[PDB]
Design an enzyme around this catalytic site. Structure first.
Site, PDB file in Angstrom:
ATOM      1  N   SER A 148       0.920  -1.241   0.065  1.00 26.57           N
ATOM      2  CA  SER A 148      -0.074  -0.008  -0.116  1.00 26.57           C
ATOM      3  C   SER A 148       0.806   1.407  -0.025  1.00 26.57           C
ATOM      4  O   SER A 148       0.351   2.480  -0.034  1.00 26.57           O
ATOM      5  CB  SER A 148      -0.891   0.146   1.161  1.00 26.57           C
ATOM      6  N   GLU A 153      -5.175  -4.022  -7.198  1.00 27.78           N
ATOM      7  CA  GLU A 153      -5.320  -4.597  -5.835  1.00 27.78           C
ATOM      8  C   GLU A 153      -6.494  -5.675  -6.049  1.00 27.78           C
ATOM      9  O   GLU A 153      -7.375  -5.875  -7.029  1.00 27.78           O
ATOM     10  CB  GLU A 153      -6.166  -3.584  -4.854  1.00 27.78           C
ATOM     11  N   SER A 202       1.260  -3.536   3.986  1.00 36.87           N
ATOM     12  CA  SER A 202       1.385  -4.953   4.322  1.00 36.87           C
ATOM     13  C   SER A 202       0.975  -5.716   3.308  1.00 36.87           C
ATOM     14  O   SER A 202       0.101  -5.328   2.549  1.00 36.87           O
ATOM     15  CB  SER A 202       0.752  -5.121   5.700  1.00 36.87           C
TER      16      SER A 202
HETATM   17  C1  LIG Z   1      -1.568  -2.354   1.707  1.00 38.71           C
HETATM   18  O1  LIG Z   1      -0.714  -2.405   1.911  1.00 38.71           O
HETATM   19  C2  LIG Z   1      -2.866  -2.850   2.400  1.00 38.71           C
HETATM   20  C3  LIG Z   1      -4.313  -2.411   2.012  1.00 38.71           C
HETATM   21  N1  LIG Z   1      -5.369  -2.960   2.761  1.00 38.71           N
HETATM   22  C4  LIG Z   1      -5.425  -4.385   2.752  1.00 38.71           C
HETATM   23  C5  LIG Z   1      -5.200  -4.570   4.336  1.00 38.71           C
HETATM   24  O2  LIG Z   1      -5.729  -5.677   4.844  1.00 38.71           O
HETATM   25  C6  LIG Z   1      -4.919  -3.591   5.086  1.00 38.71           C
HETATM   26  C7  LIG Z   1      -4.621  -4.311   6.552  1.00 38.71           C
HETATM   27  O3  LIG Z   1      -3.672  -4.866   6.668  1.00 38.71           O
END
Ligand SMILES: *C(=O)/C=C/NCC(=O)CCO
Ligand SMILES: *C(=O)/C=C\NCC(=O)CCO
Lengths: 260, 260
Positions: A43, A139, A210
């Site tokens: 992210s 995503e 993450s």
């Molecule tokens: C990006 O690193 C993650 C974005 N959202 C997915 C999640 O599960 C966030 C909580 O870890």
């Protein structure tokens, strides 16, 4: 010196691979640890997408006001804001804030689409002088973070240089630079990461990440008590596909490189 | 219970005094640990102050847009938003958001002054049926958190019941309730406390606090993946005056009481 030794000690007890890039804008000094190794961004890539959409908003007047449809088939694995608006709309401003402050993966997919796919985010990176950044996937698969996979990676050094140009430099118009910094300062997800390693008096805007392989990331602009801003990138990844997140490692890395 | 053993083990291994109140709104079931003991609220008191101003805005319909003067003399010990507006103004909405999402102590002093002093916050608590809550002092002395001192204290049970009424119940009008929930969900300071103990997919609005004697607090409203909302209050204080904050103790508590 002691910092390099201490970062090595932290990594050796961490059960993973740590990448650090600190830029002290007081004196343009840097503290680098595996700063030219590639890490999965997860992210933290959202900063590049939101910034690219801010740049678009310099020429498309009121772009940030433009409503975008959210359909049930748009939803992915983590949609804390988007799910409220299925069969409805979110503005590009709302999608930008949802991606940055809440890590909304559906929101990020609408930013990617607004930029013409993952390659459009990479093109924006190239246009601001980042030759290292690459976004390859949407995503949620951009967070698989498979060891050795070059997809959706950057290096700590390149991401630190980029975040400095976006948040303190002239990569964006002044209004757009201020909006990015305002969004990053309003992050909801960062208190356990870089921020956790810094004195409580210091102001932080950051974006966490993450994914698989216990990958645990944070990139931050830091306004220290009585000092010029810092840029800090802390990336961490583990050898097992189902490893747990290690935000504590990132906090520890931030304490080490800011301890003075 | 298993839960009672786990919380007693957490408390003992922390060296401190832990207070936990969970309300499960699926069935009105509770988990309780020292839930009728008083604890220093610290910044968790900001929720009562911001809710008191929201209540005033139900009869004074333009109140949240009212400009308030920020003077250099108004700055206290932690003013991340207010320091940007010295010799200017901030609206009551901006002050409520600064207090709740950034724990700005100058913003809290403005909310207390609007309500006619710490007594005005306590009067609002009594108007919504909270007979336990007391605010005695302004920022920053309300955070001294001296063992045995009843000033600026409440109990986990009373604060959980109150947070339920404010965020899920009818203490506020529908608009004001929605605004409070929006502010809490946008908190910047919470990711290391209650949230860090919960599955990532759960949505959280919360208000942290910290003060003297390593007091480390969080109060949260939780929308779990596929379950009715929870209210959780985790209060923690330590015997040594300059003890380290322990947000990890609050995360551990949250994991223990939600694992079922
Ligand atoms: C990006 O690193 C993650 C974005 N959202 C997915 C999640 O599960 C966030 C909580 O870890
Ligand atoms: C809150 O509990 C007490 C003060 N809030 C501001 C601060 O001093 C630390 C960050 O919350």
């Amino acid at each position: 010196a002691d910092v390099q030794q201490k970062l090595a000690e932290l990594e050796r007890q961490s059960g993973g691979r740590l990448g650090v890039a600190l830029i002290n804008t007081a004196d343009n000094s840097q503290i680098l640890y595996r700063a030219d190794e590639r890490f999965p961004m997860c992210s933290t890539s959202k900063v590049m997408a939101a910034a690219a959409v801010l740049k678009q908003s310099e020429t498309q007047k009121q772009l940030l006001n433009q409503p975008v449809e959210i359909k049930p088939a748009d939803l992915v694995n983590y949609n804390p804001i988007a799910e409220k608006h299925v069969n409805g709309t979110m503005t590009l401003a709302e999608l930008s804030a949802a991606a940055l402050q809440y890590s909304d993966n559906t929101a990020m997919n609408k930013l990617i689409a607004q930029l013409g796919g993952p390659g459009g985010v990479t093109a924006f990176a190239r246009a601001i002088g980042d030759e290292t950044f690459r976004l390859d996937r949407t995503e949620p698969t951009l967070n698989t973070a498979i060891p050795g996979d070059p997809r959706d990676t950057t290096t700590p050094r390149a991401m630190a240089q980029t975040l400095r140009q976006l948040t303190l430099g002239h990569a964006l118009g002044e209004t757009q630079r201020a909006q990015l910094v305002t969004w990053l300062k309003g992050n909801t997800t960062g208190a356990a990461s870089i921020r956790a390693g810094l004195p409580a008096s210091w102001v932080v805007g950051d974006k966490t990440g993450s994914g698989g392989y216990g990958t645990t990331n944070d990139i931050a602009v830091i306004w220290p008590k009585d000092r010029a801003p810092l840029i800090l990138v802390t990336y961490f990844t583990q050898p097992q596909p189902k490893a747990e997140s290690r935000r504590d490692v990132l906090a520890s890395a931030a304490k080490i490189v800011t301890d003075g």
